[PDB]
Amino acid sequence: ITGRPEWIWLALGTALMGLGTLYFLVKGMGVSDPDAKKFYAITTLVPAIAFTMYLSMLLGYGLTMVPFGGEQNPIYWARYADWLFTTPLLLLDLALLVDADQGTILALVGADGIMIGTGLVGALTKVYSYRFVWWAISTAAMLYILYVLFFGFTSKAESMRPEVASTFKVLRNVTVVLWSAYPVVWLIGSEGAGIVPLNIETLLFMVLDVSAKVGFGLILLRSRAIFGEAE
Amino acid sequence: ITGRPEWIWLALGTALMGLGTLYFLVKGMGVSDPDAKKFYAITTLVPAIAFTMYLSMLLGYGLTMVPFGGEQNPIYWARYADWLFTTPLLLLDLALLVDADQGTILALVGADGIMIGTGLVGALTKVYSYRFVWWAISTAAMLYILYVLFFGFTSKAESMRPEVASTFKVLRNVTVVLWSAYPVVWLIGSEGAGIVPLNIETLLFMVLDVSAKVGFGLILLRSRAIFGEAE
Amino acid sequence: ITGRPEWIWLALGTALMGLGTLYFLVKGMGVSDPDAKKFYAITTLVPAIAFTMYLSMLLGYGLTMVPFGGEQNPIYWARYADWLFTTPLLLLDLALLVDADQGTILALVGADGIMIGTGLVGALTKVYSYRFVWWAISTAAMLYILYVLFFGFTSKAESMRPEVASTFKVLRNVTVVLWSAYPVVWLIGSEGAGIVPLNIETLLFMVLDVSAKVGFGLILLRSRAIFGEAE
Ligand SMILES: CC(C)CCC[C@@H](C)CCC[C@@H](C)CCC[C@@H](C)CCOC[C@@H](CO)OCC[C@H](C)CCC[C@H](C)CCC[C@H](C)CCCC(C)C
Ligand SMILES: CC(C)CCC[C@@H](C)CCC[C@@H](C)CCC[C@@H](C)CCOC[C@@H](CO)OCC[C@H](C)CCC[C@H](C)CCC[C@H](C)CCCC(C)C
Ligand SMILES: CC(C)CCC[C@@H](C)CCC[C@@H](C)CCC[C@@H](C)CCOC[C@@H](CO)OCC[C@H](C)CCC[C@H](C)CCC[C@H](C)CCCC(C)C
Ligand SMILES: *C/C=C(C)/C=C/C=C(C)/C=C/C1=C(C)CCCC1(C)C
Ligand SMILES: *C/C=C(C)/C=C/C=C(C)/C=C/C1=C(C)CCCC1(C)C
Ligand SMILES: *C/C=C(C)/C=C/C=C(C)/C=C/C1=C(C)CCCC1(C)C
Ligand SMILES: CCCCCCCCCCCCCCC
Ligand SMILES: CCCCCCCCCCCCCCC
Ligand SMILES: CCCCCCCCCCCCCCC
Ligand SMILES: CCCCCCCCCCCCCC
Ligand SMILES: CCCCCCCCCCCCCC
Ligand SMILES: CCCCCCCCCCCCCC
Ligand SMILES: CCCCCCCCCCCCC
Ligand SMILES: CCCCCCCCCCCCC
Ligand SMILES: CCCCCCCCCCCCC
Ligand SMILES: CCCCCCCCCCC
Ligand SMILES: CCCCCCCCCCC
Ligand SMILES: CCCCCCCCCCC
Ligand SMILES: CCCCCCCCCCC
Ligand SMILES: CCCCCCCCCC
Ligand SMILES: CCCCCCCCCC
Ligand SMILES: CCCCCCCCCC
Ligand SMILES: CCCCCCCCC
Ligand SMILES: CCCCCCCCC
Ligand SMILES: CCCCCCCCC
Ligand SMILES: CCCCCCCC
Ligand SMILES: CCCCCCCC
Ligand SMILES: CCCCCCCC
Ligand SMILES: CCCCCCCC
Ligand SMILES: CCCCCCCC
Ligand SMILES: CCCCCCCC
Ligand SMILES: CCCCCCCC
Ligand SMILES: CCCCCCCC
Ligand SMILES: CCCCCCCC
Numbered sequence A, B, C: 001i002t003g004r005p006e007w008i009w010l011a012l013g014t015a016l017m018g019l020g021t022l023y024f025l026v027k028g029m030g031v032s033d034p035d036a037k038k039f040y041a042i043t044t045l046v047p048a049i050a051f052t053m054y055l056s057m058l059l060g061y062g063l064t065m066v067p068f069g070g071e072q073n074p075i076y077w078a079r080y081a082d083w084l085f086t087t088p089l090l091l092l093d094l095a096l097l098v099d100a101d102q103g104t105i106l107a108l109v110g111a112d113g114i115m116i117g118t119g120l121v122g123a124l125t126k127v128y129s130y131r132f133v134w135w136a137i138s139t140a141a142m143l144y145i146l147y148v149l150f151f152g153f154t155s156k157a158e159s160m161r162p163e164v165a166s167t168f169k170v171l172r173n174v175t176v177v178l179w180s181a182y183p184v185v186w187l188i189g190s191e192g193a194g195i196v197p198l199n200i201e202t203l204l205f206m207v208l209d210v211s212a213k214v215g216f217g218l219i220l221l222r223s224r225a226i227f228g229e230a231e
Helices: A007-027 A034-059 A078-097 A102-124 A128-151 A162-188 A198-221 B007-027 B034-059 B078-097 B102-124 B128-151 B162-188 B198-221 C007-027 C034-059 C078-097 C102-124 C128-151 C162-188 C198-221
Strands: A063-068 A071-076 B063-068 B071-076 C063-068 C071-076
Touching: A007 A034, A007 A198, A034 A078, A034 A198, A034 C102, A034 C128, A063 A102, A078 A102, A078 A162, A078 A198, A102 A128, A102 B034, A128 A162, A128 B034, A162 A198, B007 B034, B007 B198, B034 B078, B034 B198, B063 B102, B078 B102, B078 B162, B078 B198, B102 B128, B102 C034, B128 B162, B128 C034, B162 B198, C007 C034, C007 C198, C034 C078, C034 C198, C063 C102, C078 C102, C078 C162, C078 C198, C102 C128, C128 C162, C162 C198
Parallel strands: none
Antiparallel strands: A063 A071, B063 B071, C063 C071
């Protein structure tokens, strides 16, 4: 395990996701409100899935070698397995907060699936120049998602409770900033142009992942917006 | 890319799915009705997914070699990845049109999953005679789906709005004819008996795919059946 | 096929799932009640999926070799493909019976996904001692599911119809006993410590699978709890 310099960040990531999972699990024990239960379920599952995939990367299972540029390049494929399930759960948290219509939710989840799926294909593609074609398609799917979060959701939040409108606005802003960093790190890291070494890349993704999951969850689950308006 | 004679049909397929995706995306921009949004979301996602998988076939990612009959046989596995997601979306379009009950929808999607999954296993099976066992099981799942579309849905459409009944009937008929061709092409093509060469097989699937997705979508999204009855 | 001593149990399993599938399919033909249709759909799909995966194991497709302990160890990976889809369907049968809230259903299905997914990783892991780390995480996800079935569902059933409360209690008890055997068989069988040989392991899983699917389904589909209260 320690044979890879990036192991320290995989281990820290595993620990922080594990701790985040346990914290949300305990916190949600005292919850009976049916609406709050939905948000706790979604939000606890996110770091639990990430915990398993960080562990698989730490132990070496979630790593494969991909030939491109005349080299055997270490590619952590387990990231995409994580993201396939956790990024639509994160979007679902946002969509339920603002009572999004079903068509909009399906558009978001579908675009998200395309985003992660094409990122996976790009990560595993052996023809170097083609990796960036997949990156571009994935990034276009991301831009669609960000567009919807701003010009379909923000003006939906404003007709809702003030506490859900303010909580949505904060989580929207956190999401757009954090999620936009992922394609940049991929592009300059070992999957793309290879300018930033894998150990630093792994650190960067770990900070983004913990912030986008445990950070996000801490903000959401401390808000009164997750509860039905009750006396 | 041009090293494979079937590349021209993969390229045309990619282009037509891409163009179809953009057309539906633009067309649905001016839509606020919650019901119509569902149909636009579902129907736009279908060629978008197909676009990505056609591209993966064009670039060579979605192709593998399978030993059977003492030969290395080129198998485009990306078709099944496409179909796994797009065929239940197509069925969902039909089921929502007639306000199908939840049990019926689950039966359809489940049978569809079995249909595509067993087709994939058959496509990748190395014992030649066993490929046709999987083809038979998949075809039985197809026949179940077609049965339900006729003797569970058609008489559901007739108690609904005339515009939804007439639109459903047309899309049902398009679906049954087009979908029934797929097992025949598989059986006589490079996956099955090998009587029709891969380049012609690829052409045939491209015509079926564009018709079943973009053709289907053009009929559906031009109907007033996708809108709630409103003043 | 007969080259593997466990083939007889794979063949019997295939037959019993096939027969169970046909029986439930015929039985549900005379059903119009929308609630009952849901239970028939879910419950018929379960042995149908299991039939396909038992067949893939019989024909040899669903088997791979995994190096650990200095040996090539036969691992039937198709079990996890089965279980990935059938165990959440089984939980859905239980959850719908007691009209579980959406948050609880998502927690169950999510924990179940983690349970099966980590079992799959453990089954395919090449470092022997690490296989048991994945077994432990999977078992913890199982224990969560069993906890919810007892201390979240049982007291939900009691405020419902007596026929649904009594049917739920029986199916809950069947589920907890049968499902708890699976991690034990894995641990002592060819995936784990290797004390029980593969042919006996295969027998054990076949008895558990038929009981947990066809047995379970026979109890559920003969109950009046699956019908809406109607005059
Ligand atoms: C509604 C939304 C969910 C829409 C989803 C959007 C989605 C369509 C976007 C594209 C997804 C698609 C790229 C998934 C591809 C998975 C694939 C990378 C798995 C690895 O297999 C690739 C090659 C080795 O590189 O296998 C070597 C050759 C092997 C023989 C491969 C044969 C097995 C195939 C992988 C079977 C395909 C199954 C499905 C792709 C399962 C989807 C997995 C998940 C990653 C989407
Ligand atoms: C409700 C509905 C959805 C019901 C669904 C119906 C469904 C049950 C029908 C059968 C689906 C099942 C056949 C999927 C099999 C996928 C498999 C072909 C992927 C390729 O792996 C096959 C061999 C190489 O040929 O791998 C070589 C050996 C490797 C070590 C394989 C180990 C990895 C396994 C593939 C893990 C299994 C994961 C699940 C099958 C994911 C499902 C993928 C999708 C195609 C259904
Ligand atoms: C809401 C709930 C559903 C939550 C779900 C919980 C879930 C997160 C729990 C963990 C699931 C995760 C372990 C699935 C891993 C599948 C993996 C074993 C498939 C086989 O690939 C493993 C190695 C060979 O051993 O591939 C060799 C290297 C290859 C290059 C691998 C590259 C292809 C990757 C497999 C692509 C990943 C796609 C997704 C994992 C699809 C999920 C399949 C299913 C088994 C969950
Ligand atoms: C918890 C993990 C999260 C929130 C991950 C988010 C990841 C993305 C938004 C990834 C986006 C990518 C692209 C837009 C193109 C390049 C490849 C990706 C997959 C890194
Ligand atoms: C957009 C793509 C569509 C509508 C594809 C439909 C495909 C089928 C109905 C495929 C059916 C098959 C069988 C019935 C058995 C042989 C294998 C298949 C998968 C080709
Ligand atoms: C129809 C099949 C059923 C009901 C299978 C149930 C399987 C399980 C509950 C498996 C549990 C496992 C663990 C808890 C850890 C070890 C690995 C598994 C996957 C066997
Ligand atoms: C969105 C953030 C992307 C920028 C990442 C900056 C990383 C700077 C680290 C120094 C680069 C290491 C190069 C020498 C090894
Ligand atoms: C459902 C349509 C299946 C029939 C396809 C007919 C294809 C005819 C093309 C000629 C066959 C090529 C054989 C000589 C290369
Ligand atoms: C939950 C049941 C697990 C116990 C399984 C008992 C199997 C006993 C069979 C005898 C073991 C075979 C060892 C000699 C080959
Ligand atoms: C490819 C995996 C996509 C599914 C991820 C799980 C999250 C799905 C959330 C469903 C949202 C509800 C839509 C109506
Ligand atoms: C194996 C992939 C199956 C899922 C495909 C996505 C479409 C699912 C549509 C869900 C229909 C709603 C059922 C209640
Ligand atoms: C990884 C596969 C998980 C999906 C299995 C299919 C069963 C899903 C049942 C959905 C229950 C409804 C939740 C709201
Ligand atoms: C186009 C929608 C406006 C809100 C999205 C902001 C786009 C940020 C760009 C992210 C950088 C990705 C490379
Ligand atoms: C049995 C249901 C009647 C409607 C379905 C028509 C079946 C068409 C056969 C398709 C050919 C597949 C090989
Ligand atoms: C902790 C919840 C109480 C009900 C679950 C009973 C646990 C049975 C243990 C199963 C054995 C697995 C190794
Ligand atoms: C070796 C790099 C070749 C450049 C490929 C860039 C493709 C980016 C596509 C953006 C439309
Ligand atoms: C080499 C071909 C052997 C014939 C197999 C046909 C099987 C079809 C099954 C239909 C019930
Ligand atoms: C070779 C076996 C080494 C023992 C591993 C047991 C790990 C079990 C983890 C339970 C917390
Ligand atoms: C990680 C295993 C958890 C089993 C005990 C249940 C914890 C309490 C959860 C309350 C919903
Ligand atoms: C509760 C702490 C969980 C941390 C387990 C994984 C950390 C890796 C240590 C090497
Ligand atoms: C908008 C046109 C999209 C076409 C891109 C793929 C066509 C392949 C050209 C070689
Ligand atoms: C209807 C009987 C189904 C049995 C088919 C599979 C049994 C395997 C026989 C070798
Ligand atoms: C993006 C950083 C999130 C910070 C989380 C802090 C949570 C405290 C309530
Ligand atoms: C099956 C062929 C479909 C033809 C689509 C034409 C759409 C015009 C409205
Ligand atoms: C766990 C054993 C189940 C027994 C099923 C018998 C069904 C008869 C109604
Ligand atoms: C990591 C366990 C958290 C302890 C409880 C925190 C207050 C709910
Ligand atoms: C008003 C919300 C500001 C949140 C910005 C957080 C940036 C990481
Ligand atoms: C809305 C601001 C987006 C900031 C992008 C930051 C990418 C590192
Ligand atoms: C391909 C872009 C379509 C242009 C608009 C067509 C009329 C909505
Ligand atoms: C009355 C509907 C006829 C549609 C037939 C289309 C055949 C491709
Ligand atoms: C309902 C008519 C079906 C026609 C099947 C055509 C197969 C090529
Ligand atoms: C296996 C076929 C079952 C025959 C009908 C049983 C009574 C519904
Ligand atoms: C009162 C229900 C008892 C069911 C026990 C079944 C054990 C297999
Ligand atoms: C509730 C009793 C569980 C029995 C476990 C049996 C495991 C073989």
